[PDB]
Amino acid sequence: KVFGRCELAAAMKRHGLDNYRGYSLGNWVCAAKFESNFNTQATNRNTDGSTDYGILQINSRWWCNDGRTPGSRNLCNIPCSALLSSDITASVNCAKKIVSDGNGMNAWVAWRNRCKGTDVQAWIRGCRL
Ligand SMILES: [Cl-]
Ligand SMILES: [Cl-]
Ligand SMILES: [Cl-]
Ligand SMILES: [Cl-]
Ligand SMILES: [Cl-]
Ligand code: NA
Structure with missing residues (x-):
């Protein structure tokens, strides 16, 4: 499933990510944009x-x-395949564990390089939340 921006913002809010460990909703939407282009089926191999x-x-x-x-x-x-579902519950619950492990959202390279320090509120602007 390829989410729309506001659709994904609303789903992430329903699942408790808004201000989770102090990270406002726009941070999570920005990270998803640059990690996967909002596509639940994205995969990439590492070196x-x-x-x-x-x-x-x-x-x-x-x-x-x-x-x-x-x-x-x-x-x-979890099996990694569960993170490719159109239902984002498994991804959100796992992300909560990751962001709690001491390093915050710096675990997401795309967040650190493309979202951190920017006006991330722009990613939820105009959305009915
Ligand atoms: Cl977009
Ligand atoms: Cl925000
Ligand atoms: Cl393995
Ligand atoms: Cl859901
Ligand atoms: Cl933090
Ligand atoms: Na593993």
Whole structure:
């Protein structure tokens, strides 16, 4: 599923991401835009053989099991394929664990390079929330 901007903002708000660990909703929408272009089916392989999955590009090196990342962890206790669903619940719940692990949203490279320090409120401007 390819979300619209305001559609995704509303879904993320319903799932408790607005101001989660102090990160306003626009931060999460901006991260999803640049990680996946709002596409739940996005995948990208990393140099070390791990793979990033879904709307927030969560990495099989630490967070999910895909059966092909030897020596990795599965800290969200899910198969990585569950992060590709049109229902974003699994991605949101795993992202909550990630953002709580000490490094905040710096875990998302695209957030750090393209959202951090910008006017992220623009990503939810005009949306009925
Ligand atoms: Cl957009
Ligand atoms: Cl915001
Ligand atoms: Cl594995
Ligand atoms: Cl949902
Ligand atoms: Cl933080
Ligand atoms: Na893994």
